[PDB]
Amino acid sequence: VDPIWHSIRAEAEEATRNDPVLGAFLYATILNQPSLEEAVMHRIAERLGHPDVSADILRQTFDTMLEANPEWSHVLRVDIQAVYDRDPAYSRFMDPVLYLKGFHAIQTHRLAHWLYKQGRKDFAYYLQSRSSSIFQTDIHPAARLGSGLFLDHATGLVVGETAVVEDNVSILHGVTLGGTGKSSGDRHPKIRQGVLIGAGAKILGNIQVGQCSKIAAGSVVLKSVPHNVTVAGVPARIIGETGCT
Amino acid sequence: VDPIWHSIRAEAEEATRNDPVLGAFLYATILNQPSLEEAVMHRIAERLGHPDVSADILRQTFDTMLEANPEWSHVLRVDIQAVYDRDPAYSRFMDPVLYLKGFHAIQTHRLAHWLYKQGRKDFAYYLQSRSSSIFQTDIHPAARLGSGLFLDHATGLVVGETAVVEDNVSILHGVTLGGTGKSSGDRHPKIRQGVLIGAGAKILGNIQVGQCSKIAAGSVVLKSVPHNVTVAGVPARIIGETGCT
Amino acid sequence: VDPIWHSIRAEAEEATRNDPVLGAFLYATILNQPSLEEAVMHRIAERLGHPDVSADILRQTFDTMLEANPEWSHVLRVDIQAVYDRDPAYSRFMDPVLYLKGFHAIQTHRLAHWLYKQGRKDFAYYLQSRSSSIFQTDIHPAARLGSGLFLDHATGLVVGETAVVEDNVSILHGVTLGGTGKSSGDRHPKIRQGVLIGAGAKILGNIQVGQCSKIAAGSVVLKSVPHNVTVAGVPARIIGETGCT
Amino acid sequence: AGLDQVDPIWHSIRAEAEEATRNDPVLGAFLYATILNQPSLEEAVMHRIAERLGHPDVSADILRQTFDTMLEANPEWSHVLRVDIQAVYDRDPAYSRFMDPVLYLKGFHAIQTHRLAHWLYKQGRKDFAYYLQSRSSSIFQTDIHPAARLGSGLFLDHATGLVVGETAVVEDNVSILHGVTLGGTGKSSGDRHPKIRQGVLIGAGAKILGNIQVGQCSKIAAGSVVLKSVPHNVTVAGVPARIIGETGCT
Amino acid sequence: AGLDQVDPIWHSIRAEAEEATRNDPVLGAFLYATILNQPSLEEAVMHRIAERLGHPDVSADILRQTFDTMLEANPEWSHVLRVDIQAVYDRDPAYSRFMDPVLYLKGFHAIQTHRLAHWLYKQGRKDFAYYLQSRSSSIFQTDIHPAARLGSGLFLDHATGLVVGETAVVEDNVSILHGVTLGGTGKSSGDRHPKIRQGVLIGAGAKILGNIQVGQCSKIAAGSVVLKSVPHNVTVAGVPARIIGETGCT
Amino acid sequence: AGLDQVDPIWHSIRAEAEEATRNDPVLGAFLYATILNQPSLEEAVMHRIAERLGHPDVSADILRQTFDTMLEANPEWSHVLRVDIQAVYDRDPAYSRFMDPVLYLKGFHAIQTHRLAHWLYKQGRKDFAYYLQSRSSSIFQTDIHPAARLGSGLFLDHATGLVVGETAVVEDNVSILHGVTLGGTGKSSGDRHPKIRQGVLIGAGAKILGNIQVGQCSKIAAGSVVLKSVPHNVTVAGVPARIIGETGCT
């Protein structure tokens, strides 16, 4: 089975019957695709395509990335699953695939990151630049993002060159994972597993946010945060202990 | 009479004489249009059009919404009037129509909201997604927005599924009307009449901001705000009493 | 010599050999151009072009601006130099030219500002509107920006009509240079030389930020800031003395 | 229940478009945006043609808005386009649907594009008219001077390579194939292109040259070069053309 | 090292495309996206053709995905397109490369577009088929009815102005020039367009009209009008056409 | 006040474009971006042609930048394009303005596109050249081999269906109509296409086939098939062509 894919295809078929004028959109992006992988790469290439660099070139490059990284099949699905499990506003597997710029931005970064590591720096920067303009997510291609990442609303996200985000993290819009100013080498946050980072929060410097911690909306976080705590405020203070899942 | 429309047409004619290369823009969007309604729907369809879903399809759908909601004629004009009366930076009725993504985003939501209520969920999400990418306004289609809404600068606005904004409200860029985390059902703010919400403010949870209240730039608002007060800070505190108009 | 230009051409040639599919991008924008000026105006016109107003019309208008302002040759280069000297994340003169929406937004404003002063108000607003949508930078065309301006990440920048930014300033994303509310005439900040303004900061009213001062990420600045100090917090407080360069 | 509520051409086209969408849903954007969302056949035809001619140089929208202006000034276009559609339906065995010319056949799209251009030209909007002529020549391969006069119930079958000069006149119920020139001898000044009478068929690749008349109900065989006026009710063939027989109308 | 690993046509095309890019790097986006990034000649041809026919009305993507469906259902298309490419290579002195038809020659693009349309038409997808016919008529200037039957090793040289009727049959190894009509007399109902046998050459501007046969290995001189069946192994010329001599194949 | 400051063609075009905009302001984007914002006629012509040929496959910009390179290497193009414009103005009654070929007439756009392609081909940039030939065939319906040689003061009237072979030569002051082939007999190897001398007029649909010469000032009637060299100062007509009379130049 591939239950995420089969659900997505059933939803697209229903969506098309319900609203025929969207048939070109839904067949080109889901129903004529032979796999979820090709559906996701297609949508993102179409959103990022421009006269400067066609959707085709983007999609063909994405194909080469998938070929080199079969593990992306798994990561992709855990990422879709993170949306489904963590966002009450949408009730379909199809929604992140078609609609959610946060989800698109994560996979775009995975592409840009892979290119950057191949020494295809320009392609990597081009995708960073286009993602920054169209998804409003400025993620440096050398950043490292884990799987099961949930990028909710996303607008205004900034992630620096040396930032690391571990698995099962949720990140709101307006979040900066950035540097302080005395910044040469390793200068951006390391975000551990199961963290939630609320809207507008700034996490600055080579500091750590410990496992399962929550950063309240609007915090400015300048010192490392221990595991299992809630921080809030400008500057941030521990305001509680917290759990995971 | 229709003084907003007649002023807009006189401005466009003058603008065209003054700068002929913009004649195609100004005739296609204003001067060849038989009404303000068709001018507004045209501009917004053109800004939102994409290979995925043409400007035409968007404009035709907008036409069906107007046909089903003749009250939008009135709402549209009070919305234009809110810009004219509340923003010193522009002195023309034409400016919101042509230029102001906040104004475009409000009417886009009105379209998406109507579609959502018709059971055209995908179209609704598609427009939410496109508005989030192009206008940087992420408004859930189930949100409810009153008339005489002023969306100034707009970039980064987020409005949740169960948020309600009442009439004659002004909202700056960077504003979140969102949820806290213990969020099942009704979980997003209710904004009463005549409120001003300043840049970067986050209003979180199923809480109310009372009539004529002001939220200072950068506030994190976690508790309901009574009528006629100014709140400021992280977290927000009452810092004064205030009036309307 | 023109060492910035010659370095940019050598980088583009190398980039093209390294990744041939980007040859159309890199030749159209750099290598077939006879000057850095024409390269910069071309990239920005291509990013801002739309069915509403073609990249060609934008580029031709840009040409007229350069012809009227030969000083832009110098300003452009000091602006590129500000990126090179102040951002560790990129190591090429070519990077701002091709990729950095902040850099594109600054020159876009310089164009819009010049048009505004010519009485080509609509063109000016059109470019403000398009820059606000594509670069997420909302800069009123009557704003005044000095040279050696560094707009890092840029997303969500708002600059009001009467704001003045002097030379050698660095500005992060999420920054508002805006008004308080009792705002008739001169109502927006004046930013002096060598200032750094951190992510998310709001500077509100006709107040001054003195030379070489630093505004920490997330500050709400409501009172004028003296020279050579660091301010932080909501509301902002002096937290230190600081220097320039 | 006024007489103009009778419109079997539009209703069949709406039914055919919906059935097409069910059977091939990927075509739904095309068929809804061009037919099913339109409140009239006039608006569907204007939209189709506008989209075919649309270019970064002059948008489909500007073309469609200009078409709207033409219809408002020329109400008879509603009947003319219906008779032109009926011509295809009656005269071409290769297509079974009223929808076929509306969506597909560049001859039908060229005819209405000329009607638009012709109106614009008479209004003193000569650049708009030449622009349409230019775009029609490039996309429909039909180079029709905007001063040319074309009747109704015109069937432009296949159409590729059609040239019609400035002073040509084509009357009602004519059928014209691809590769046809209604042109000049090259040796006169004013009135200098052909006058085609009602009911004429002009075969593929025919050149008709000069201020000459093709008489009513006559037929021009494929590849004829026609240099002298043709009487009514004959077939001509050959290079140059000669009467090869007698013919009737309908 | 199965037999179908032998593919000198694809390998030469890959080499020619890479050499072209080195020599003229601004063409790198075109040549990589159309040839060098593709894992097969089939995918390059589908991509090229999809991009040429693509329009806001129906995207290149939808066309390319539909092409993919045709290849999956018609595996023989892999050999057919290779023989069609080999026809150009063998029969046109003006071009030296297998890559020339794949990228440039609208006759070759039209042939495969017809193959797609023909398959769709037989599947009951008649709107898709007419849409392709319509788009091919406008962009390649080749108006080929989707019910027409076209053999392999077809060379459509220059192509502009080609018209092929609904009941036409063209067999293998035919060469057809621009301005050619395989059409009707206008006076019959069912089977009514030409049957072209193997090895035939049809010269520029020829009209072949009626349910008539052009016999094997025969040649139709430029500008001929052909109204009667042509026996094998002759050349015909003239208006109307007459046997002017004897001819062999190859 | 050097001699090359005299440019009545450019100045009339600038005046005509501005007057057009006042009269029909919706055309302002087109006319300003193509004429009024340009600092030279060369730049207007390059821009117009680049925009017509532009495609996602190779942008108008790349085409315009490549045109710029051609002009820089071939300064005589400034005079050639002006004589080509003057040819239309002098030879076509249907248009009254120097601006008409620059904006509208695909024959004029094809000629300059060939000039670009021809230069590229001689530079070893054969893919670029074939790409332009391919795009011109599809958008202007003029299939001109880049190795063909075309003189100045060429008038390509209507143009649809033009085919010119690899070894064709056309000298100065020629007028050529639509449906014209300067092609091959199909039976030779090297030099194999026509040599057209100065002052020739070639009528619509004419096929001129072989390494044959059309003598100076001669005229080819519409629909002629020309298989033998034509002496100077005659008119030929027919299938095949025969001398039908005597003719002079101008």
Ligand SMILES: CC(C)(COP(=O)(O)OP(=O)(O)OC[C@H]1O[C@@H](n2cnc3c(N)ncnc32)[C@H](O)[C@@H]1OP(=O)(O)O)[C@@H](O)C(=O)NCCC(=O)NCCS
């Ligand atoms: C001429 C036409 C109208 C019908 O012909 P008709 O009036 O029935 O005449 P007939 O077929 O009886 O032919 C009588 C004579 O005319 C000649 N003739 C007919 N069509 C001719 C043509 N196109 N060119 C030259 N001669 C022709 C015949 O050779 C015959 O000569 P003959 O008696 O010396 O042997 C038809 O054949 C034609 O060419 N029309 C155009 C159809 C077309 O373009 N279709 C394309 C479909 S895509």
Ligand SMILES: CC(C)(COP(=O)(O)OP(=O)(O)OC[C@H]1O[C@@H](n2cnc3c(N)ncnc32)[C@H](O)[C@@H]1OP(=O)(O)O)[C@@H](O)C(=O)NCCC(=O)NCCS
């Ligand atoms: C007919 C053709 C196939 C070769 O001819 P062929 O079989 O060698 O015959 P010949 O050249 O020996 O000519 C013999 C007779 O036929 C005539 N003839 C040849 N081609 C003719 C044509 N197109 N039209 C009319 N008559 C023709 C000759 O005039 C000659 O008549 P005559 O003996 O009374 O003087 C060739 O000339 C042709 O026209 N084919 C099409 C090629 C084409 O379209 N090329 C375009 C390249 S872009």
Ligand SMILES: CC(C)(COP(=O)(O)OP(=O)(O)OC[C@H]1O[C@@H](n2cnc3c(N)ncnc32)[C@H](O)[C@@H]1OP(=O)(O)O)[C@@H](O)C(=O)NCCC(=O)NCCS
């Ligand atoms: C031939 C042409 C140049 C002028 O002809 P001309 O030199 O003045 O010769 P005349 O008109 O005096 O005709 C003399 C003989 O030639 C014949 N003739 C002329 N043009 C002919 C043609 N196209 N085909 C066949 N025969 C032709 C006449 O029938 C006449 O024969 P006859 O004496 O046996 O009756 C002109 O008619 C022509 O066809 N040129 C092309 C114009 C064109 O293509 N225009 C299209 C405008 S869009």
Ligand SMILES: [Mg+2]
């Ligand atoms: Mg449009």
Ligand SMILES: [Mg+2]
């Ligand atoms: Mg004949």
Ligand SMILES: [Mg+2]
């Ligand atoms: Mg595509």
Ligand SMILES: [Mg+2]
């Ligand atoms: Mg012949």
Ligand SMILES: [Mg+2]
């Ligand atoms: Mg361009």
Ligand SMILES: [Mg+2]
């Ligand atoms: Mg003749």
